[PDB]
Enzyme design. Structure first.
Site, short mmCIF file in Angstrom:
data_model
loop_
_atom_site.label_atom_id
_atom_site.label_comp_id
_atom_site.label_asym_id
_atom_site.label_seq_id
_atom_site.Cartn_x
_atom_site.Cartn_y
_atom_site.Cartn_z
N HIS A 69 -1.08 8.58 5.07
CA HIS A 69 -1.84 7.50 4.45
C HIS A 69 -2.78 6.86 5.46
CE1 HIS A 69 -2.85 3.58 2.78
NE2 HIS A 69 -2.21 3.01 3.79
N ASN A 104 -9.84 2.90 4.47
CA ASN A 104 -8.50 2.60 3.97
C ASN A 104 -8.67 2.05 2.56
OD1 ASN A 104 -5.79 1.97 3.62
ND2 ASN A 104 -5.92 0.08 4.81
N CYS A 128 0.81 -1.21 0.00
CA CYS A 128 0.00 0.00 0.00
C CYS A 128 0.84 1.26 0.00
CB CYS A 128 -0.94 0.00 1.20
SG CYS A 128 -2.20 -1.28 1.10
N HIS A 137 -12.68 8.15 7.40
CA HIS A 137 -14.10 8.10 7.74
C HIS A 137 -14.96 7.96 6.50
CE1 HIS A 137 -18.07 9.52 9.10
NE2 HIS A 137 -17.70 9.03 10.27
C1 LIG Z 1 -7.51 -2.40 14.53
C2 LIG Z 1 -6.66 -1.15 14.38
C3 LIG Z 1 -7.60 0.04 14.41
C4 LIG Z 1 -5.67 -1.04 15.53
O1 LIG Z 1 -6.25 -1.63 16.71
P1 LIG Z 1 -7.55 -0.97 17.33
O2 LIG Z 1 -8.73 -1.70 16.83
O3 LIG Z 1 -7.43 0.49 17.06
O4 LIG Z 1 -7.40 -1.27 18.89
P2 LIG Z 1 -7.42 -2.55 19.85
O5 LIG Z 1 -6.75 -2.18 21.12
O6 LIG Z 1 -8.79 -3.12 19.92
O7 LIG Z 1 -6.48 -3.56 19.05
C5 LIG Z 1 -6.10 -4.79 19.71
C6 LIG Z 1 -7.21 -5.79 19.58
O8 LIG Z 1 -7.25 -6.26 18.22
C7 LIG Z 1 -6.44 -7.41 18.09
N1 LIG Z 1 -5.47 -7.13 17.09
C8 LIG Z 1 -5.12 -5.92 16.61
N2 LIG Z 1 -4.23 -5.99 15.66
C9 LIG Z 1 -4.00 -7.34 15.50
C10 LIG Z 1 -3.16 -8.06 14.65
N3 LIG Z 1 -2.37 -7.49 13.75
N4 LIG Z 1 -3.19 -9.40 14.76
C11 LIG Z 1 -3.99 -9.97 15.66
N5 LIG Z 1 -4.80 -9.39 16.52
C12 LIG Z 1 -4.76 -8.06 16.38
C13 LIG Z 1 -5.86 -7.66 19.47
O9 LIG Z 1 -5.74 -9.05 19.62
C14 LIG Z 1 -6.96 -7.07 20.33
O10 LIG Z 1 -8.06 -7.94 20.16
P3 LIG Z 1 -7.96 -9.07 21.30
O11 LIG Z 1 -8.87 -8.60 22.40
O12 LIG Z 1 -8.43 -10.37 20.68
O13 LIG Z 1 -6.54 -9.20 21.80
C15 LIG Z 1 -5.90 -1.22 13.06
O14 LIG Z 1 -5.99 -0.01 12.34
C16 LIG Z 1 -4.46 -1.68 13.13
O15 LIG Z 1 -4.13 -2.57 13.92
N6 LIG Z 1 -3.62 -1.13 12.27
C17 LIG Z 1 -3.94 -0.96 10.86
C18 LIG Z 1 -2.71 -0.70 10.03
C19 LIG Z 1 -2.78 -1.23 8.62
O16 LIG Z 1 -3.76 -1.84 8.23
N7 LIG Z 1 -1.72 -1.02 7.83
C20 LIG Z 1 -1.70 -1.25 6.40
C21 LIG Z 1 -0.93 -0.19 5.67
S1 LIG Z 1 -1.78 0.59 4.27
#
Ligand SMILES: CC(C)(COP(=O)(O)OP(=O)(O)OC[C@H]1O[C@@H](n2cnc3c(N)ncnc32)[C@H](O)[C@@H]1OP(=O)(O)O)[C@@H](O)C(=O)NCCC(=O)NCCS
Ligand SMILES: CC(C)(COP(=O)(O)OP(=O)(O)OC[C@H]1O[C@@H](n2cnc3c(N)ncnc32)[C@H](O)[C@@H]1OP(=O)(O)O)[C@@H](O)C(=O)NCCC(=O)NCCS
Lengths: 411, 427, 427, 411
Positions: free
Chosen positions: C322, C355, C155, C351
């Site tokens: 991004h 993504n 990405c 929003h």
């Molecule tokens: C989900 C996201 C919003 C971050 O977490 P969040 O939802 O804001 O916050 P949370 O604290 O709920 O995240 C942790 C929770 O999700 C799970 N989790 C988050 N990321 C995880 C991953 N990569 N693998 C497994 N579980 C994951 C954790 O296990 C926890 O759930 P659980 O109760 O089962 O442990 C998300 O945007 C992210 O992780 N990053 C995205 C980045 C991306 O997609 N990059 C691509 C580049 S273009």
């Protein structure tokens, strides 16, 4: 508790052989309807994943390139009443089945149900696609405890039991890092002016089938294995007192014991053939059915009520060898139970010479497929070489009755 | 004065394009444990497909295909049936790439931190992270490396990567470019029964090439070739040429490459459209002026005289035609009137290694190096055609004569070549 | 003699690079006939998966993910279950690409037969022929076009394509470069239930962008931005940062991207490894000398003072982060101490559009244009990160002040933005 | 023969409604256990692939956004023994099922077998996952002859039969190119301050179901369709001679005919309730259950031998209205067949108003679901608009016995 996950593969010669016609001999085609089914058990298979068991097969098949060949057929001179086959040595390969078992291996060694050799080695023949049927198959099973069972499905067309066991030794030596002996296959076989109209008394001329080199069962033949100890042949030595001894105690009384066992269940067991797996008759040991086919008649003494030493002296010193008459016959032979009950003496072969790294096998049994309608026994040495091992291939109705009619002498 | 020669001097020098030298290249030699003859390929086809219509077709194709007996398939197509997963294809990309760069690093003394441009191409296989990021993770390349992964461009991306490393080396001074041209043919195996999608099963074999290009002035005593021309011709605007080589999905849902029936009528006209945009560049003036003096003779006399074809035998000495199939090489021998010595590299590359990749031109170049026929100042033509019918070409010129032991991919079998390649395999 | 200023003249002129001009760009706006609300995504999730564990996890991620009710999915992810094929994904590639180039050709007056360079990038989908040969087939572009297809580069291959066209806009003069940067998300849908592989299902939405770059001096008045710096940081040399965003197959045999648990810390130490190679370029001299004076103060007094981060608010007026996720944006806002107005484009693109692709940067640029905040002489910063953890950056400078009716992707909804994006969504 | 290839989908409102708590009326909560199963047949479905039928559903659904909502439950003020449901207007959407059938459609329309609406529209209810159950299901089946059958499965909670039929017509007007009328839903429905502790005589209160809003059947309820012509209407119109005519024979004579027919299969049918779908009582028709529920006792006398004209004059003008107490009653009331037979009069609705392009439907039959253990009939206009059409919903063992009793009077 059965084997599953049959992942098939193919190992080829590592070098191109070009157009080669490995012409089969007359005795090569006289033994085409039979199939060796041999497994080799091991107490541990650590460090023996199926890439280090397959990688020595590429230099091993360089020296034995007719094993990776395929059967073809040529054209006759005039009208095509014969069609002499030959192993076309294209690098077509041999099947490597990679199965696995969930049962314990040692409790499968301690078994009486005749379903070991049919399960643990791959059950195919020179089948309906005769031009595309491999001459060798390897089944590599892994058990729950961690054992290993290399099961070889050898076709009796290309080579006999010494030429199969030493050919597997020549792969285990490359696997062990050693250098094997360079195998001859150089003097080409030629058709002998035979046609042998006097039929042998060891054979049964079946109908000339076209593309299925497997005479069908009819009965329900099964491969039962039983081990005979060293003390039992001592009991076979304390019966011939007061007379001369010409019976070879390593094989002959062992054959006469199971002959006496079959001569309480089946009545007409009078004529009996043997096929001598002799090392002295290996004139140019290259890859050839150098068995000595001979039948034995019991004209005066019926074997049902006669002592085992007398049957031993009858079978050993009184044999009529006809190993050239079965070769000069015009195919479709079925010597492993054509007319008589056959006794195979494959004890001289280095059967436990399948050292992988330094690992002696813990159990080595052979079985046969395409056995005839009277049965066969397969004597072979055990691990220490003191006793023997006999895998008898009966029609299946006489298996459990042999367990009662034989266990009295063994006990 | 004295400024009368400076402004036609150093003004012209700052307009001169940077030269791009081919330092060295390492083709991947597949082991003989992975070889697939004709017979075991046939016995593997008639064990997973019970219909004897998609097998009698494979017989005729692999008979009249010109592929020999040493062609290699990866260790997933040796099973009956093949089990092509992602892990079995990614770990096959770590075999043909990392043992073709290691053959290049150990023969050039190249440092990993001296790599500034990395251009990897592979048509069908394109994982995430890219095949360039796999090389950057394995060989521990720099943080600011220009890495590009040209996936999807077919069997003619071997010269698109060359042109991209050419144009990236004009912008960046004193840099080394790495070019890896592969074809990971574990997911490129067709699992169905449609006849048009079964021709990549017969022809596509293993292979790779790791190319080192640089623009440094120090790499003129050590380098082999200098890049003269790269000519790209994209016939994809036509609708027949676009959907000729097309990745469809059949009725059962098995993906694969569907070659059209008129494959040779497009590849002969996407290539003769590439000859005309390379004629002005590589021909001598005595051929060009004679050609358009005969072309003006069919303008005022009548509507077309006998068409004089320009001799490329007088323009080049070495031809590396892409080893797509046998039916492309024998018709390009008919048009361009090449000798059998000129098309010997492509026929023996098709016979030994098969239709490998976008990098069959590098095995052909290793053939005409390993025979010792590559002298100094020899001109090499590398014609390459693919999907979308991009038909790229490239012209090299040899800077130092190559010795006969070249330790490439041909060493054990170069004393048994060329062989008489028959029309039909007798089976 | 007056020939001493011409040698600091024309020699200096021939050592200056050509300027790269963004003429315009046309972001694809998806219709409301393909939108997926939060509730119908939850109802589709707990209808093909029996377990009450992988629906309660996607329910938490899509609640705290910062996506809205206007995010769109292709016409194969609306079925229960989805039926992604290669003919229903290529038909989705003829929709987001072609209706974004058509939004660019009519708004700039671009002629298709005057496109010289074409660079398409799509991470997962890479058919044969590629997504560049599809555009050459559609708009009938020329046979000597320089086409590329950067596939598999995550990405962040939007700015890789920007740098690729820019470094092709230095070798070839008087040429136009068409940069298409999409993400075909019909085969980008994971089918199984692994909890680290279900995050691209809950984040990736529809989106495309067609970019027209040119180096012609006539376009100095029609262009909107001039490209200043492109800075690439490939952190794939680490073993954690290479297999962080990593495509696998699970135990059931379903492909899909798998995001590791340490995705945040691997990102934030690849962002700041890209900030320290753009700080010497774009910061004012006063901030650089103040940072150097506060850096030499931790050398002689105590081994480690307070970490003085440079103010990038005095070096840029617009920040285009991004839109990866909600947690990824507000930790980059936490690092550089950005105002909520600075990350307002990246929050409201997450929003509104979600993504989308690698092309979320262009929807963010269209947001800060459509609000009427893009004055001339302003500096744009586009931070884009992806797989293999390449973290590329780009710096644009605004040429002419953009009018408020933009006819982009934000026109029908720019008067309802910004919205209060809560921490959780009530369900 | 049967329908197959169910390809489910989901269409949503075209504009975001935000968070909207669409409150439900008490009459809406009374009818929450029943479900409209109404199919619309077509002679030709050319130019009607399942994209040009699905794209007008997006500007139709933002007009009627509580149809795309989902049921939730608010928390009570004091003790939470009642918890009033409300349609939370998240755009979760309605289901689109795209099936097909290889049968000729005209033979299936003229089939006397009761299973036709069970196959042609999606048999789903507000199921045990109540918070994620769709409130509307369109089933679009295409036939081998070239026909089309739009099968609308409507939950009776959100709106009644006029409010379903006019909503589907409002979809078809956007599909054709017309402009639908102003779909008001602007006054919020409020819980009326009436408890009505005595149960009405027209109903039987089932147990307090928690998350499955469907009474279990017990029997094997099915819906049988029989067409009654205007010649049979004029036949029964010549039976009230010598008396004043106050029985509106458009509905009353047919309902009296089916009541007389069921009063030889069931003995105790003396008290029968009538759900009146009056168009004059639609006070602000927005999306509402503005029926008229009333029970009718048959004057003590038995309808087993009572004439159909006397039954018409007894059932028309003598109705005891209970539509103000069945709404004010609290909890799971089961109107349609709870304690009495129900005779629904859905004949004045614009049933053939599904003008798709210029295409009148060839056949429209409505069925119900969740009908209790007493039965339900459903008059509706036929294709010419002159006669009638009745889909009677019986226990199933009363279906074939009604075929022998009604065939002579229909003839
Ligand atoms: C989900 C996201 C919003 C971050 O977490 P969040 O939802 O804001 O916050 P949370 O604290 O709920 O995240 C942790 C929770 O999700 C799970 N989790 C988050 N990321 C995880 C991953 N990569 N693998 C497994 N579980 C994951 C954790 O296990 C926890 O759930 P659980 O109760 O089962 O442990 C998300 O945007 C992210 O992780 N990053 C995205 C980045 C991306 O997609 N990059 C691509 C580049 S273009
Ligand atoms: C494979 C090759 C040897 C052709 O073999 P050939 O001996 O010419 O075979 P023919 O096509 O004449 O054989 C006849 C059959 O071919 C089939 N055939 C050949 N090409 C076909 C195609 N692209 N699609 C479908 N069928 C095809 C016909 O269906 C025909 O069927 P039949 O058996 O009923 O006659 C080679 O010349 C070739 O096909 N070229 C392809 C080169 C290539 O793949 N390019 C590499 C980069 S794209």
């Amino acid at each position: 508790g059965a084997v599953h996950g049959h992942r098939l593969s193919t190992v080829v010669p590592s070098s191109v052989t070009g157009e080669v016609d490995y012409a089969l001999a007359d005795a090569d085609l006289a033994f085409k309807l039979h199939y060796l089914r041999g497994v080799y058990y091991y107490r541990s298979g650590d460090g023996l994943a199926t890439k280090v068991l397959k990688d020595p097969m590429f230099p091993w098949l360089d020296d034995h390139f007719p094993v990776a060949g395929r059967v073809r057929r040529a054209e006759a001179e005039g009208d095509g009443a014969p069609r002499r086959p030959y192993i076309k040595c294209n690098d077509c390969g041999v099947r490597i089945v990679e199965a696995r078992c969930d049962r314990d291996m040692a409790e499968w060694i301690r078994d009486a149900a005749p379903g070991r050799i049919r399960q643990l080695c791959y059950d195919k023949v020179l089948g309906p696609e005769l031009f595309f049927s491999p001459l060798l198959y390897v089944q590599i099973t892994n058990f729950k405890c961690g054992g290993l069972a290399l099961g070889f499905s050898w076709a009796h067309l290309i080579g006999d039991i010494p030429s199969a066991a030493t050919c597997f030794n020549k792969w285990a030596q490359i696997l062990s890092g050693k250098k094997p002996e360079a195998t001859v296959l150089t003097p080409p076989n030629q058709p002998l002016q035979g046609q042998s109209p006097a039929a042998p008394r060891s054979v049964k001329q079946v109908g000339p089938m076209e593309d299925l080199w497997l005479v069908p069962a009819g009965r329900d033949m099964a491969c039962y294995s039983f081990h005979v100890s060293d003390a039992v042949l001592k009991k076979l030595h304390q019966q011939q007192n007061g007379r001369q001894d010409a019976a070879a105690g390593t094989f002959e009384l062992v054959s006469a014991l199971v002959w006496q066992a079959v001569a309480k269940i089946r009545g007409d067991v009078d004529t009996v053939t043997v096929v001598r797996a002799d090392a002295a008759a290996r004139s140019g040991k290259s890859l050839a059915n150098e068995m000595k086919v001979g039948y034995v008649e019991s004209a005066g003494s019926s074997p049902a009520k006669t002592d085992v030493a007398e049957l031993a002296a009858l079978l050993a010193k009184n044999v009529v060898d006809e190993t050239a008459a079965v070769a000069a016959f015009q195919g479709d032979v079925l010597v492993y139970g054509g007319a008589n009950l056959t006794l195979v003496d494959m004890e001289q072969v280095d059967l436990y010479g399948l050292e992988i790294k330094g690992q002696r096998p813990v159990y080595v049994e052979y079985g046969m497929d395409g056995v005839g309608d009277e049965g066969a026994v397969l004597v072979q040495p055990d691990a220490d070489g003191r006793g023997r091992l006999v895998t008898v291939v009966l029609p299946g109705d006489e298996i459990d009755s042999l367990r009662a009619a034989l266990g009295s002498a063994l006990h | 004065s004295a400024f009368l020669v400076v402004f036609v001097g150093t003004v012209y020098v700052m307009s001169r394009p940077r030269p791009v030298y081919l330092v060295d290249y390492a083709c991947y030699k597949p082991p003989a444990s992975c070889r697939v003859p004709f017979a075991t390929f046939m016995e593997h086809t008639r064990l997973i497909s019970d219909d004897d219509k998609s097998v009698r077709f494979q017989t005729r194709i692999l008979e009249r295909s010109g592929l020999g007996e040493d062609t290699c398939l990866p260790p997933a197509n040796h099973y009956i049936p093949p089990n092509p997963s992602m892990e079995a294809s990614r770990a096959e990309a770590q075999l043909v790439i990392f043992s073709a760069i290691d053959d290049l690093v150990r023969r050039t003394g190249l440092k990993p931190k001296d790599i500034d441009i990395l251009v990897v191409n592979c048509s069908l296989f394109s994982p995430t992270p890219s095949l360039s990021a796999m090389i950057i993770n394995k060989y521990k390349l720099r943080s600011n490396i220009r890495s590009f992964n040209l996936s999807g461009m077919g069997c003619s991306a071997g010269l698109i990567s060359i042109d991209l490393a050419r144009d990236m080396l004009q912008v960046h001074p004193n840099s080394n470019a790495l070019v890896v041209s592969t074809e990971i043919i574990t997911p490129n195996f067709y699992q169905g029964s449609r006849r048009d999608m079964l021709l990549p099963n017969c022809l596509f074999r293993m292979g790779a090439a790791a190319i080192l290009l640089s623009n440094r002035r120090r790499e003129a005593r050590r380098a082999k070739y200098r890049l003269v021309h790269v000519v790209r011709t994209h016939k994809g605007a036509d609708d027949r040429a676009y959907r000729c080589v097309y990745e469809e999905e059949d009725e059962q849902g098995f993906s694969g490459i569907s070659l059209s029936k008129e494959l040779m009528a497009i590849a002969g006209d996407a290539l003769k459209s590439n000859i005309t945009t390379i004629g002005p560049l590589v021909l001598p003036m005595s051929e060009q002026l004679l050609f358009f003096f005969r072309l003006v003779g069919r303008k005022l006399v009548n509507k077309g005289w006998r068409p004089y074809i320009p001799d490329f035998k007088l323009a080049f000495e070495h031809f590396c035609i892409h080893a797509g199939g046998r039916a492309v090489i024998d018709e390009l021998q008919k048009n361009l009137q090449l000798s059998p010595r000129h098309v010997e590299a492509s026929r023996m590359t098709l016979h030994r290694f098969g239709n490998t990749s976008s990098s069959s031109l590098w095995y052909e170049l290793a053939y005409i190096e390993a025979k010792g026929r590559m002298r100094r100042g020899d001109r090499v033509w590398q014609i390459g055609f693919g999907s979308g019918f991009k038909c790229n070409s490239a012209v090299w010129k040899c800077l130092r004569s190559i010795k006969t032991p070249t330790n490439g991919p041909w060493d054990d079998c170069i004393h048994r070549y060329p062989v008489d390649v028959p029309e039909v395999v007798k089976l």
